[PDB]
């Protein structure tokens, strides 16, 4: 309502089966809590570190295997005038793990069908928090220590607005669009 | 009503199964009441100490394991003009533990879908109180002793309002946005 | 009605199962009636002694264990113009112990979702009275003796109203906000 | 009606199971009729002796144990313009003992939720009369003898009305608010 | 109707089970008909002797034991403009003994909830007549003989009306409020 | 709605059977995560690398075999004024893997039936992300490294607009329509 949008064996659309039922066995637990490789962490120009969704998918495929996990829609797609949002549930080994809401910003009317995939990835990322995957990305100590040895805040020039902005970038990457 | 908002095997949405049924066995009990590491406690500029939600998630994954616990929605999301609130229930080993209401302040209409995740974390934090996780954060003696040996109240200058505020910060951290 | 507010295996919302059915076995009984440590008792500036709710939670987790007890809502949340109130029932080992009404004063419209947690704690405190937890806090002899050897009534100055009030404080603590 | 108020395994809300069914065994009987310690009896300034409700709770926990007794609501809370009243039933060992009406005077609209706990205690006190707990408080000989060796009627001065009232106080206690 | 008032295993509210079914065994019979101790009998200023209700409760607890007897409401509370009345039934050992109507005079609108307890005691006293408890209080010979050796009719002075009334008092007691 | 379009053994149209049920056995897992051959990766003139859908089909036929996988429609075809979109579900070995939405841009009214096949391929590509097929195409490090050793950004001339655009092309391919 407050979102100014209109809708775009086990009934997994509504079922809560297995949620918090029994923990996974040892090797899955070790695979899920494996420390993140520092080379896999990206940072946005405003200074926010994150992990690409494809790394989350790779971790899930390493821990549960292909066909051992999936994303199930839990609500209808809501298309706000500037974003597309939907709820998704993570199922691992026939077990409901989490239900999280994802969103993706779209900028063109024709980009709405593309935005619904970003939303899905966002939901997947937010579901993996219940598994402890990539938890260091939310650790303030980890963020603070990562940004002093692996990142740099450079005053670069925007290629379009012709203005200069101090942006954050990794020490291995280079200045990029929409800047120089 | 008084909240000026509009709605946004076991039916865990309404079920009360296992609530206060039987205590967890010994090693889970020891894992839950493990003392908090002082380096993991953060403090806000106004002087309120807390633990990041990711530490609560890590503790829950250490005590019950991945897939051994989960959060289940218990009510509909209510979107007040300045906050998003919802009730969540903590399920550990097929057992309802607590039902707590979380809230998250949002400042933009497009930030509502993001706020619903903060709410979830807030609810999770408030559910862990029934487990005794992080109980020292509510102990007045603990708060009083923590703020004299591990924290500092520095008169810093706000980077935007150009005014000076005595804010609280850890002795290991440094002055930060929205201040100097 | 007289409250000028509007609503905000076992069906524990309405069930009375186990209420006064059979007493707990010996070690739980000893754990519940353990004398309170004098260092854990706080006193308010007006001179009223109390125990923090986190100590009640710790006692319950020590007597029944995590997962061995819980709070179940018994009524709908009523939001009076200045307070939030709700009834809660304490369940210990699958047994209804007490149903008590809690309340929490809120001062901002955005503080209502936060107030619903204070209410819950209040209800928990009032439920523990049926267990005899912290009973010395209601003993007039205990209150009278505690306030002469462990407390002090100091004429301090309010930091905002710039007036002087004789307030009660422990001999170990110090003057605090909203005073000097 | 005449009260000018508006409403605020076994269905114990209405059940009469066990009422006067079989007496408790010997040690419970001895625990219930144990003579009251004279140091535990309080007296009000107008000259009425009583026992604090926490002593009744302690006696019940000593005779039946924690979880061996409880209070069950029997009617709806009626909120008269100056008092809150409700009926409660005492259940001991799965047995209905008594149904008694309690009341508590409130003086502020925000004090109604607090008053509902006083009412509960009052009902508990009045239920214990069927068990013979504290029966000496209703014995005229006991009251007459207690007030001559353990109490004193002193002409003290009210701290607010600045008038002098002959009030009753124990010989061990001292003059107190709302007097000197 | 003629009362100008408005309403305020076994369904004991209406059941007649056990009424006059089988007599109690010998020791209960001896306990019930034990002669009253003369020191326990009180007399009112107008000259009417009686036994305090707490003595009736003590006798019932001595004969049937705690939990071996109880009072069950039999009608709705009727609140006349100057009295509160209700019917109660005495149950002893799962057996209906008597149904008697009690009444209690109240003098303030806030005293109605307190009056409902006096009514209950009155009903209990009137139910014990079927058991023969305290029967000497209705024996005209007993009353006549008790008032000549244990009582005194003294012309005392009312502390409020400042008039003199010949009142009846025990030889052990003293003049009391509302007189000198 | 927000899309301005009109509709154009196991009920696989709606069923969720097998979603995240059990992982595929070892050789299928190895076949799915086989590294992509660099010669099979294409790049668009704007600089976006991708894999042709026929390579995804070949990988699926290599991992599951012909008849071992299929695409099932999940929604109705929606024909926006400039695109055709539809949801498809990937079924592998009688197991639902993913449900993804595909879209295809059409430029003529007679090209709508042709566009519905592009949509299907798009959906298939987006379903294979749950299997980890071609995951390197979403790895920012992989994209960055691929574009410096295998690609070239050449300033070529558009054959129609007669303007010059710096476009991206592989080092093995040549300039092509709609350019020179």
Curated annotation (Swiss-Prot), chains A, B, C, D, E, F:
<dbReference type="GO" id="GO:0003697">
    <property type="term" value="F:single-stranded DNA binding"/>
</dbReference>
<keyword id="KW-1135">Mitochondrion nucleoid</keyword>
<dbReference type="GO" id="GO:0005739">
    <property type="term" value="C:mitochondrion"/>
</dbReference>
<keyword id="KW-0234">DNA repair</keyword>
<protein>
    <recommendedName>
        <fullName>Mitochondrial genome maintenance protein MGM101</fullName>
    </recommendedName>
</protein>
<comment type="similarity">
    <text>Belongs to the MGM101 family.</text>
</comment>
<dbReference type="GO" id="GO:0000002">
    <property type="term" value="P:mitochondrial genome maintenance"/>
</dbReference>
<keyword id="KW-0809">Transit peptide</keyword>
<dbReference type="GO" id="GO:0000262">
    <property type="term" value="C:mitochondrial chromosome"/>
</dbReference>
<dbReference type="GO" id="GO:0003677">
    <property type="term" value="F:DNA binding"/>
</dbReference>
<dbReference type="GO" id="GO:0036297">
    <property type="term" value="P:interstrand cross-link repair"/>
</dbReference>
<dbReference type="GO" id="GO:0000725">
    <property type="term" value="P:recombinational repair"/>
</dbReference>
<dbReference type="GO" id="GO:0006281">
    <property type="term" value="P:DNA repair"/>
</dbReference>
<keyword id="KW-0227">DNA damage</keyword>
<dbReference type="GO" id="GO:0042645">
    <property type="term" value="C:mitochondrial nucleoid"/>
</dbReference>
<comment type="function">
    <text>Performs an essential function in the repair of oxidatively damaged mtDNA that is required for the maintenance of the mitochondrial genome. Binds to DNA.</text>
</comment>
<keyword id="KW-0238">DNA-binding</keyword>
<keyword id="KW-0496">Mitochondrion</keyword>
């Amino acid at each position: 309502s407050k979102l100014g949008g209109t809708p775009l064996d086990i009934d997994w659309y509504t079922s809560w089966y297995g949620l918090g039922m029994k923990p996974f066995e040892a090797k899955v637990q070790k695979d899920l809590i494996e420390p993140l490789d520092p080379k896999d962490i990206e940072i946005k120009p405003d200074g926010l570190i994150y992990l690409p969704e494809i790394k989350y998918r790779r971790i899930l495929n390493k821990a549960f295997g292909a066909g051992g996990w999936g994303l199930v829609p839990r609500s209808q797609t809501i298309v706000t005038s500037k974003l597309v949002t939907r709820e998704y549930g993570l199922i691992c080994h026939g077990q409901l793990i989490s239900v999280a809401r994802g969103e993706q910003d779209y900028f063109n009317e024709a980009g709405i069908p593309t935005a619904t995939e970003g939303c899905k990835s966002n939901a997947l990322m937010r579901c993996c928090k219940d598994l402890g995957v990539g938890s260091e990305l939310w650790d303030p100590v980890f963020i603070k220590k990562f940004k002093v040895d692996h990142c740099t805040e450079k005053f670069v020039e925007h290629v379009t607005t012709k203005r200069k902005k101090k942006i954050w970038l990794r020490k291995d990457r280079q200045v990029e669009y929409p800047y120089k």
